Amino acid sequence: TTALVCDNGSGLVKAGFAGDDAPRAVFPSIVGRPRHQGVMVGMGQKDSYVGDEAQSKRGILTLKYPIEHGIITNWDDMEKIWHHTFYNELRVAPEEHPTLLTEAPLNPKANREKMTQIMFETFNVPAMYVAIQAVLSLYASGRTTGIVLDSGDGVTHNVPIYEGYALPHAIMRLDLAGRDLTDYLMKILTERGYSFVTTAEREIVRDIKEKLCYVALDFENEMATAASSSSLEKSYELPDGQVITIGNERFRCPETLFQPSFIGMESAGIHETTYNSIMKCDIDIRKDLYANNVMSGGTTMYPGIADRMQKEITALAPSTMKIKIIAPPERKYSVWIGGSILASLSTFQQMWITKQEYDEAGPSIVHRKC
Amino acid sequence: TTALVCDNGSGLVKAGFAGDDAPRAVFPSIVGRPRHQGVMVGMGQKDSYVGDEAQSKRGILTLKYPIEHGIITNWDDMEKIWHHTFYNELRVAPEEHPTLLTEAPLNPKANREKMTQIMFETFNVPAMYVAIQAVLSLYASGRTTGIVLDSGDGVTHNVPIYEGYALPHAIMRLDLAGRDLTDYLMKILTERGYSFVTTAEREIVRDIKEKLCYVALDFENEMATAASSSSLEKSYELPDGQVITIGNERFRCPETLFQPSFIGMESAGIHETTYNSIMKCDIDIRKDLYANNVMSGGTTMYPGIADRMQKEITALAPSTMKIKIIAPPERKYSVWIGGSILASLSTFQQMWITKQEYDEAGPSIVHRKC
Amino acid sequence: YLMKILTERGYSFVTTAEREIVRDIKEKLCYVALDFENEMATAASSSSLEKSYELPDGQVITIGNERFRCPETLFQPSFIGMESAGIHETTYNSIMKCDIDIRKDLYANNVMSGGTTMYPGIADRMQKEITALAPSTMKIKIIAPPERKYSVWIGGSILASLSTFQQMWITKQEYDEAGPSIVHRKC
Amino acid sequence: IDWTLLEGETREERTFRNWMNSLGVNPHVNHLYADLQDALVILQLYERIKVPVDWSKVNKPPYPKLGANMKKLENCNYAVELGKHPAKFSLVGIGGQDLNDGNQTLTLALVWQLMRRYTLNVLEDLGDGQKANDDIIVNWVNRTLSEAGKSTSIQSFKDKTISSSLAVVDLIDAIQPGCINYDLVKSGNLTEDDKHNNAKYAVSMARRIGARVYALPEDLVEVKPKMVMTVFACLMGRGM
Ligand SMILES: Nc1ncnc2c1ncn2[C@@H]1O[C@H](COP(=O)(O)OP(=O)(O)O)[C@@H](O)[C@H]1O
Ligand SMILES: Nc1ncnc2c1ncn2[C@@H]1O[C@H](COP(=O)(O)OP(=O)(O)O)[C@@H](O)[C@H]1O
Ligand SMILES: Nc1ncnc2c1ncn2[C@@H]1O[C@H](COP(=O)(O)OP(=O)(O)O)[C@@H](O)[C@H]1O
Ligand SMILES: [Mg+2]
Ligand SMILES: [Mg+2]
């Protein structure tokens, strides 16, 4: 009938139908289990909480993410989220819809193979496909040339594409994304005396990060600005009514994207990783890659992150090239939007991994067809 | 019915209609094929890139020349260039036009036989003819006496003609031309740290050839001038914005024409090859040949090439002859220009190889009629 | 490239200290396949090519297919995105650029040196690949001494101990006059 | 009918553009390298040259804002595919993305072969079968004009007497006596400039009777022999 587009990120699940312009279901990719003692009869019958109900009852739960750094680490909890996606949030029978799934590059091969076997044997989909997330972000931009910087909850990765051809040797992947920024904001919030330890309190710090944090155009003068004045101070009200104030941690947290040494990592920032990915490409295609730096994912939604990238790559570029970052306001769903474009094309209808092909080749068919 | 004049050399294709004074289509004779992985649907459909498009998208292609040293080495890719020439660049049906083709002297006989078979059995031309390039370059100058130095991309050859009579025993041929100067410039550019390896980077070095290289009048004083001062230094901007500087390789690259031992060849330079061809001619026609040295082809376009041939031959000549180099500004199309002159003559209309003659004698007809 | 293809099994090495671990894995477990397409079919069926390696922290990683796919980049540089030809074709192309009279003696003396020529099966593969490119009446002979890793040093101690070499040094007096450019004349 | 000269446009592109509009494509082609990029006009011209087009494989001009370029790129891939196998054109090195990008050389490499096929079909339905000839159609006009009787008779298409449109307007009313209309015709008092007006005066009514003439008036004022024969070939079909 119609195809399902499911983008399983580390943090959020984006699901919907091919041909729409926005996902129908966006809920956190968590599973919660009660950690206290049930005393009222008839109220402890529920063994697990999955979607937004795991988030609303998080005070009495321990929260687990099945996906970490793009790799599915819990396969029983992943089937819970897929059951929640198909039957509760989209309310469709998966046996009638081909399903399009997404994955990051440079990812273990058993990950792609297991989600193929899950969809065919547990959910019994007629066909499926696994696409690369950065390729789909280029579909959403209406482009066939450009280097994509995708930064979500688990993985930051770069994929150069020129005229619809990918250069895999230039694909660069960094395991630094939003969940690592949230954990660093927790670590530096203790400097002002605010302590967040519980997995439920980690969801609070993520809410603080998405509201008050921003990228400084020049990091060393924001530090001098915040040291002398209090014009960067901002307040946040906790769920119990307490009020916390941060002035310096607002831009020290996203600065880990450009200085990964803040969290003790030896890697280079996202500006140098993009430039190094371009310099691994043929000298003829570099001018077009400099002019199409496509941004994607929720970790690129900080205020002032495209101004900071445009300034940092310009300092590394040969001063004759013109640098252009395309950061659309719909960045958070570019991977999903591009997936619904791809699954709607009639030229794509012969590239599904049909169940017939899976029955004769097994779960390894996904490596040849994707 | 207007005749077609296709002067396809090792480097470029020159095509047009007999009667015009300049070729209508001048594109590189290359065929590119994608070397990378196609990821976006609807973009991997093109299997071959032929004309200037292969030059536009060379970043993702491996570029092959179907012609090497005047000899067609890839007959499947040579038909692509001819199909592109007739249908895309000229937009004529070959079944209605006699086609004039060119070829270098002392060339394998199967090359001329097989390009006669292609023209009759694949393109189904009404008539065709194969002409020697150095003879056509003499029509273009409006002469009937002279010795032609033809230097293109693959072959350098000398042909002496007197009163419209060729002296075949004095015909010279040197397999050292523009392409071998490109490969020498790539090799000596690494002395400054500039590395060009791929087939797409050879096109960048050829571009540096045609814009910055010149012929030294006296090689040993230019070498001492460039060593002391810095006035011969020049800069060039690569496609990605990097700036390279060369000061000494400008005149050492074309010096290989006069000292073929720079690339490990035992042959003599072009100045001693044209002189050896004169000394193989009858003593009575030598004075006329000394005063008509006709240069043609792109490799004769270096600044100072004609003043150096004048000086070098004068040192070998008997000091009472007067040496005259004829280097018209339209040198690059003399072979094509002279072929449009020849195909326009009414005297020539009985010299075509018609299809009826080919149907009774096969491809060998070209050996007796041309 | 071994680091890049180790992530297919879930082994992530990203730091400059972890690159020294991958170098150690390469030198101990990698080998050149005589026929690449048959070894790929062999590893895809059984697990007799699998081997284990213990990391400095005690973790044990297993590779079965990356063992010969890593040195295969020498013969197929397109694995790492390069357009160049393999070391067997580059060696053959160097011979074909030489005088036709000296090619028979070059075919019979193919000398390898350096650490990257120390993979098990590298000389058998070069022997087989050049033979397929040679005119079938020549004799291809690869010379791979067990002391390959120090051939450049060993030959430099032979050269520097010769008495005829003692006039080929660039002395300090020569450098004091011509400057650092003296090295281009004497060497 | 539009007869105007653009600032930059070669005579080859004017002939192709005029042939498209005079053939009845649903949009009005104003720029060749800007109106063919969705391949809808090209797919329409395939029907005019007896090439079957499966319209279930074509994306209709209402395009979603998301993935519109991929929708148009699929159309260009179908147009190039139909040119190779069933149309038997020679399209070497041409893909769908060349039409979609508006490549000037490779767009003209396809449209000139469409026009050649269209003219070839005009020259074959005039006869019984697979015969196409020029001197059969030149004495036809010299014969059908004797029914009324007028001093207009040409030897071939290269004659300079058809420099003015007096010879073609002499034939335009022989088939249809209801289009006499010699009000604006000129005879004997014509310069080089004023015969452009009657050339348009003659070509314009050819579509009124039913002769689908796709030649420019400039192709008639001068004696371009390949386009003037199309005018008489298109007039024969309306006549007989
Ligand atoms: N406006 C925002 N500012 C800063 N961070 C944000 C914003 N919106 C979302 N994020 C972060 O982005 C991450 C989710 O991004 P997303 O692309 O949905 O991840 P995934 O690819 O795993 O679904 C979360 O870690 C969240 O904290
Ligand atoms: N201005 C220039 N200066 C020096 N060399 C040139 C110049 N223009 C073209 N060339 C050389 O001319 C060659 C092509 O010449 P051409 O006469 O077309 O050869 P062919 O007859 O083989 O096609 C190229 O290899 C290029 O290096
Ligand atoms: N047994 C082995 N098998 C495979 N590779 C090896 C082996 N021993 C050394 N190498 C590789 O060869 C290189 C040895 O360095 P060497 O040959 O001395 O190079 P260089 O001359 O540049 O110093 C190292 O990079 C190492 O990775
Ligand atoms: Mg994501
Ligand atoms: Mg030539």
Side-chain angles (χ1 to χ4, degrees):
Chain A
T1 311
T2 187
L4 300 174
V5 178
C6 187
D7 181 13
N8 298 119
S10 292
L12 295 165
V13 178
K14 274 82 59 183
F17 296 87
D20 301 7
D21 63 358
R24 181 160 316 182
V26 178
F27 60 95
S29 187
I30 50 179
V31 169
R33 278 172 187 95
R35 63 187 200 90
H36 290 128
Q37 201 204 18
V39 298
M40 313 210 67
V41 173
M43 279 301 282
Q45 322 290 144
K46 203 175 163 178
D47 59 318
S48 45
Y49 305 69
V50 177
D52 284 296
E53 69 275 16
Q55 193 76 242
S56 59
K57 294 207 196 322
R58 74 194 175 203
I60 56 169
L61 305 168
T62 179
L63 301 187
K64 288 299 167 52
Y65 285 92
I67 297 170
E68 183 178 1
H69 298 304
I71 307 148
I72 305 182
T73 62
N74 201 313
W75 279 102
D76 291 331
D77 277 4
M78 197 72 236
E79 299 190 35
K80 288 188 205 314
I81 288 182
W82 278 326
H83 263 270
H84 183 71
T85 289
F86 298 146
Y87 288 92
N88 305 347
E89 287 269 352
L90 295 182
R91 293 179 280 269
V92 288
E95 301 93 8
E96 316 170 19
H97 302 260
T99 309
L100 172 74
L101 306 169
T102 75
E103 206 200 28
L106 295 166
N107 205 3
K109 285 173 60 194
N111 195 70
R112 189 187 297 249
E113 281 179 40
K114 277 169 212 163
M115 67 166 78
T116 298
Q117 167 186 32
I118 288 304
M119 295 271 150
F120 278 123
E121 296 176 13
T122 300
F123 299 104
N124 204 41
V125 299
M128 66 153 306
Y129 192 77
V130 187
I132 307 298
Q133 287 156 10
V135 178
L136 295 176
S137 296
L138 215 59
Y139 278 112
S141 58
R143 276 167 174 86
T144 49
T145 291
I147 175 163
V148 181
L149 178 64
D150 194 15
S151 192
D153 202 60
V155 175
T156 306
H157 63 263
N158 266 318
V159 173
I161 295 168
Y162 186 80
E163 304 285 335
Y165 286 96
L167 292 95
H169 67 277
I171 285 171
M172 293 177 71
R173 152 161 186 165
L174 177 68
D175 275 347
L176 201 158
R179 197 177 300 168
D180 292 328
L181 299 183
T182 299
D183 295 350
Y184 178 71
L185 183 57
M186 290 163 94
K187 185 249 189 184
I188 68 177
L189 270 170
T190 65
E191 295 169 11
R192 289 177 172 260
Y194 313 125
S195 181
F196 303 91
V197 194
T198 301
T199 67
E201 300 187 89
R202 194 190 317 278
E203 308 295 320
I204 292 175
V205 179
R206 186 190 38 77
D207 194 80
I208 300 163
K209 183 199 69 198
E210 294 176 23
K211 289 198 197 320
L212 303 183
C213 278
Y214 70 103
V215 178
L217 188 69
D218 191 9
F219 178 74
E220 294 294 328
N221 296 295
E222 282 280 325
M223 291 293 268
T225 296
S228 80
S229 176
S230 66
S231 61
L232 298 175
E233 298 293 328
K234 269 198 165 40
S235 288
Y236 183 89
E237 183 178 1
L238 293 182
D240 72 328
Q242 309 204 237
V243 172
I244 69 172
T245 300
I246 47 165
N248 198 13
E249 296 84 359
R250 297 176 63 207
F251 55 87
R252 282 174 58 217
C253 172
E255 191 64 25
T256 305
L257 286 174
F258 301 87
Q259 300 191 64
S261 64
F262 284 175
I263 60 167
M265 265 172 80
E266 202 183 1
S267 298
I270 52 166
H271 63 301
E272 284 175 69
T273 304
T274 298
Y275 173 72
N276 290 348
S277 185
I278 289 171
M279 296 298 291
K280 284 176 176 289
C281 299
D282 305 275
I283 189 157
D284 284 317
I285 73 153
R286 279 179 207 164
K287 186 184 65 54
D288 281 0
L289 295 181
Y290 281 130
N292 305 112
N293 302 288
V294 176
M295 272 185 154
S296 182
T299 314
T300 62
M301 307 288 306
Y302 295 92
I305 194 169
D307 289 328
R308 177 77 181 268
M309 278 286 261
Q310 189 274 331
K311 183 206 167 192
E312 290 292 329
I313 297 183
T314 298
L316 297 165
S319 170
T320 303
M321 300 268 99
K322 64 90 175 179
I323 314 298
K324 199 204 185 324
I325 296 89
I326 296 90
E330 61 270 37
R331 257 169 303 177
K332 287 196 68 196
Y333 308 112
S334 294
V335 175
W336 191 93
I337 285 156
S340 71
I341 286 162
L342 177 67
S344 292
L345 301 168
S346 66
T347 181
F348 180 73
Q349 297 306 117
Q350 295 298 109
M351 320 167 59
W352 292 106
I353 303 173
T354 310
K355 200 197 185 319
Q356 183 66 41
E357 321 178 46
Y358 171 80
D359 282 313
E360 62 209 22
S364 64
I365 186 77
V366 75
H367 295 314
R368 286 127 58 181
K369 293 188 66 65
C370 309
Chain B
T1 82
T2 305
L4 294 176
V5 190
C6 185
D7 168 29
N8 56 243
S10 289
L12 299 160
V13 175
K14 277 79 68 179
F17 300 92
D20 309 348
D21 63 322
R24 202 175 290 222
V26 184
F27 58 95
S29 75
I30 49 179
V31 171
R33 270 172 190 88
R35 49 190 282 250
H36 288 130
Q37 175 180 42
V39 290
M40 314 198 57
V41 305
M43 294 299 291
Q45 321 274 336
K46 186 186 287 185
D47 56 337
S48 299
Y49 299 66
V50 176
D52 276 295
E53 45 164 1
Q55 198 75 219
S56 286
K57 291 180 172 63
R58 57 182 193 214
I60 51 164
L61 301 177
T62 186
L63 303 177
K64 303 291 196 59
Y65 285 89
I67 297 184
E68 181 65 26
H69 289 301
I71 310 167
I72 294 154
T73 65
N74 197 1
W75 283 99
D76 270 331
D77 280 358
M78 199 52 206
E79 300 181 42
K80 288 182 174 303
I81 293 191
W82 276 328
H83 261 283
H84 172 84
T85 293
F86 294 149
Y87 294 92
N88 309 338
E89 289 277 341
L90 295 184
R91 300 177 276 271
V92 288
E95 297 96 15
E96 323 170 10
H97 298 260
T99 308
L100 179 66
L101 305 150
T102 77
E103 183 178 1
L106 294 163
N107 206 3
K109 285 170 76 219
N111 199 61
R112 180 189 296 249
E113 275 190 41
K114 201 161 172 58
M115 65 180 288
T116 306
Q117 191 174 19
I118 291 311
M119 278 306 132
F120 275 128
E121 287 180 20
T122 295
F123 297 108
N124 189 359
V125 301
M128 61 79 71
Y129 190 86
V130 190
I132 297 300
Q133 294 158 5
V135 185
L136 299 177
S137 166
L138 208 67
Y139 285 109
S141 56
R143 293 171 155 83
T144 42
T145 286
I147 176 168
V148 186
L149 173 59
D150 206 306
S151 197
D153 202 61
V155 180
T156 312
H157 57 268
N158 276 278
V159 171
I161 299 166
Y162 184 78
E163 303 293 302
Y165 283 99
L167 287 91
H169 64 277
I171 284 173
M172 295 296 172
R173 159 162 189 163
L174 180 50
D175 265 348
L176 156 66
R179 194 174 301 176
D180 297 327
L181 301 178
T182 307
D183 294 5
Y184 184 61
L185 187 60
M186 298 174 92
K187 186 196 145 297
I188 66 180
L189 272 173
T190 76
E191 300 170 7
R192 282 170 173 264
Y194 312 131
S195 159
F196 304 92
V197 168
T198 71
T199 66
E201 288 184 274
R202 197 195 324 280
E203 317 300 312
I204 300 180
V205 182
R206 184 184 38 76
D207 197 87
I208 303 168
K209 196 159 64 83
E210 305 172 356
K211 290 202 222 319
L212 296 179
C213 277
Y214 69 102
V215 174
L217 189 68
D218 169 23
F219 183 73
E220 294 294 328
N221 291 357
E222 286 288 327
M223 270 289 261
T225 297
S228 77
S229 70
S230 176
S231 62
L232 292 171
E233 294 293 328
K234 271 199 169 37
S235 293
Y236 183 87
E237 196 196 297
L238 294 175
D240 73 328
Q242 318 196 257
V243 169
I244 69 176
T245 300
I246 51 170
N248 197 22
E249 300 84 3
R250 289 176 78 211
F251 53 87
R252 288 169 50 216
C253 171
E255 189 70 23
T256 308
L257 290 171
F258 301 88
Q259 315 199 37
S261 53
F262 282 174
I263 60 163
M265 274 178 27
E266 197 176 3
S267 301
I270 58 173
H271 67 300
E272 301 215 356
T273 299
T274 178
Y275 172 72
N276 286 331
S277 199
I278 293 159
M279 299 308 281
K280 278 169 156 291
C281 289
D282 299 286
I283 193 182
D284 283 317
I285 74 166
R286 281 181 205 158
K287 188 185 62 60
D288 270 8
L289 297 184
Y290 276 133
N292 300 295
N293 299 301
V294 181
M295 307 220 289
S296 68
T299 305
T300 72
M301 294 299 291
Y302 294 92
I305 192 66
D307 305 281
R308 175 71 177 273
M309 284 296 271
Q310 171 96 26
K311 181 211 178 179
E312 291 296 330
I313 292 169
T314 308
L316 299 175
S319 178
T320 76
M321 311 285 78
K322 64 90 175 179
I323 315 296
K324 173 75 171 67
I325 311 290
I326 295 91
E330 61 272 18
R331 256 169 293 174
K332 276 201 56 200
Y333 309 112
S334 290
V335 179
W336 189 91
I337 283 162
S340 68
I341 286 163
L342 168 77
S344 295
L345 300 187
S346 198
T347 317
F348 188 70
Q349 306 309 322
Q350 273 72 54
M351 294 177 70
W352 296 104
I353 302 171
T354 76
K355 198 174 192 320
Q356 287 69 240
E357 308 163 355
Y358 171 81
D359 279 338
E360 309 153 17
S364 72
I365 185 75
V366 71
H367 291 318
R368 65 183 180 179
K369 291 200 71 99
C370 292
Chain C
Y1 179 62
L2 186 57
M3 309 174 76
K4 181 246 170 192
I5 72 179
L6 271 181
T7 71
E8 297 173 12
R9 282 171 176 265
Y11 308 130
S12 182
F13 307 93
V14 309
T15 63
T16 73
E18 286 183 278
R19 200 200 314 280
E20 307 305 289
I21 298 174
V22 185
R23 187 186 39 77
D24 196 81
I25 303 173
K26 178 197 67 192
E27 298 170 12
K28 291 190 191 320
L29 298 184
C30 281
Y31 70 103
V32 175
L34 185 65
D35 184 17
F36 186 67
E37 294 294 328
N38 290 9
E39 285 279 321
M40 287 290 275
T42 309
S45 68
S46 70
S47 66
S48 61
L49 290 182
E50 300 290 328
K51 268 195 169 42
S52 305
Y53 181 90
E54 184 177 299
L55 295 182
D57 72 331
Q59 290 176 44
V60 174
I61 71 168
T62 297
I63 51 172
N65 194 23
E66 299 83 6
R67 294 179 66 211
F68 55 88
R69 285 171 53 218
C70 178
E72 187 66 22
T73 307
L74 289 179
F75 302 91
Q76 311 195 47
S78 63
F79 283 178
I80 63 157
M82 267 174 53
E83 203 179 341
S84 302
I87 50 161
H88 65 303
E89 283 182 36
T90 303
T91 299
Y92 174 70
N93 288 340
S94 193
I95 294 165
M96 293 321 270
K97 287 176 151 295
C98 293
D99 302 292
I100 188 166
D101 290 307
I102 75 155
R103 285 176 204 165
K104 189 195 59 64
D105 284 334
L106 293 187
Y107 280 134
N109 303 290
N110 297 302
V111 175
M112 294 183 287
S113 69
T116 314
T117 62
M118 298 283 328
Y119 294 91
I122 187 68
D124 279 316
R125 177 72 178 272
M126 281 283 282
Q127 167 84 42
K128 177 207 170 186
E129 287 296 331
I130 299 179
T131 298
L133 296 178
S136 164
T137 48
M138 305 278 88
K139 296 183 290 294
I140 317 296
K141 172 73 175 72
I142 312 290
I143 295 90
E147 61 268 43
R148 259 169 297 178
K149 290 194 59 192
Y150 308 107
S151 284
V152 173
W153 191 92
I154 284 164
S157 67
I158 288 162
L159 168 69
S161 56
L162 300 176
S163 66
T164 61
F165 184 75
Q166 307 304 309
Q167 299 93 11
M168 305 200 44
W169 291 107
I170 301 169
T171 71
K172 191 153 213 322
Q173 300 60 24
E174 298 167 277
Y175 168 82
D176 272 347
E177 293 179 353
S181 66
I182 188 70
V183 75
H184 294 311
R185 320 217 280 287
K186 298 201 69 73
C187 303
Chain D
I1 310 300
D2 186 10
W3 310 107
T4 50
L5 271 295
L6 276 77
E7 52 265 43
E9 186 173 359
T10 55
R11 256 289 297 286
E12 192 194 8
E13 306 158 349
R14 285 181 51 87
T15 310
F16 295 149
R17 186 168 69 95
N18 171 65
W19 163 74
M20 272 153 171
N21 304 335
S22 310
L23 193 56
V25 292
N26 189 359
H28 190 253
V29 192
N30 294 318
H31 310 307
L32 294 174
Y33 313 118
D35 294 334
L36 303 166
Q37 290 188 20
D38 63 358
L40 277 156
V41 187
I42 304 175
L43 283 166
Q44 282 186 90
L45 300 172
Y46 278 118
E47 293 179 353
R48 310 300 156 89
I49 60 160
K50 297 177 183 178
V51 184
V53 182
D54 197 353
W55 284 100
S56 54
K57 296 182 180 180
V58 187
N59 304 318
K60 300 289 94 176
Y63 290 126
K65 277 74 69 177
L66 281 179
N69 50 307
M70 311 305 300
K71 292 303 189 183
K72 299 161 184 174
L73 177 55
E74 274 174 289
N75 286 343
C76 295
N77 285 326
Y78 190 42
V80 174
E81 182 65 26
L82 284 182
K84 293 185 173 192
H85 157 60
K88 294 293 185 183
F89 296 159
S90 177
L91 304 165
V92 169
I94 304 182
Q97 55 258 34
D98 309 303
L99 319 181
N100 189 41
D101 286 28
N103 193 277
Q104 299 192 10
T105 298
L106 300 182
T107 302
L108 291 190
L110 173 58
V111 296
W112 91 266
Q113 296 183 73
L114 290 159
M115 180 168 215
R116 175 153 96 90
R117 187 59 64 89
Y118 181 65
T119 302
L120 182 63
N121 282 357
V122 172
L123 260 52
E124 303 209 25
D125 62 355
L126 261 50
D128 55 354
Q130 50 95 33
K131 66 95 173 179
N133 162 283
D134 47 8
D135 63 358
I136 292 147
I137 68 175
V138 66
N139 57 6
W140 190 87
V141 56
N142 307 318
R143 188 270 299 164
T144 186
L145 290 176
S146 63
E147 298 293 327
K150 286 173 183 179
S151 67
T152 61
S153 295
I154 62 173
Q155 277 75 11
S156 183
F157 308 113
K158 294 185 290 294
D159 206 320
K160 298 296 289 183
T161 187
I162 62 174
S163 176
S164 178
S165 49
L166 73 165
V168 295
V169 72
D170 202 283
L171 183 63
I172 205 168
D173 57 356
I175 297 89
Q176 183 96 45
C179 295
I180 298 180
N181 52 42
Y182 289 86
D183 49 316
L184 294 175
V185 68
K186 272 77 177 174
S187 297
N189 53 337
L190 59 89
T191 184
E192 202 269 350
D193 186 273
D194 62 358
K195 57 163 165 263
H196 294 332
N197 296 115
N198 46 64
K200 296 184 288 290
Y201 179 85
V203 176
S204 68
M205 281 174 264
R207 283 82 58 85
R208 293 180 181 177
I209 295 91
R212 294 178 65 88
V213 165
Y214 52 89
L216 294 165
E218 304 71 8
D219 278 293
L220 183 63
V221 170
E222 292 82 3
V223 170
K224 315 284 174 222
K226 266 79 69 177
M227 294 299 291
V228 295
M229 61 79 71
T230 77
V231 183
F232 300 122
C234 296
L235 277 163
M236 185 180 288
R238 179 66 179 86
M240 61 79 71

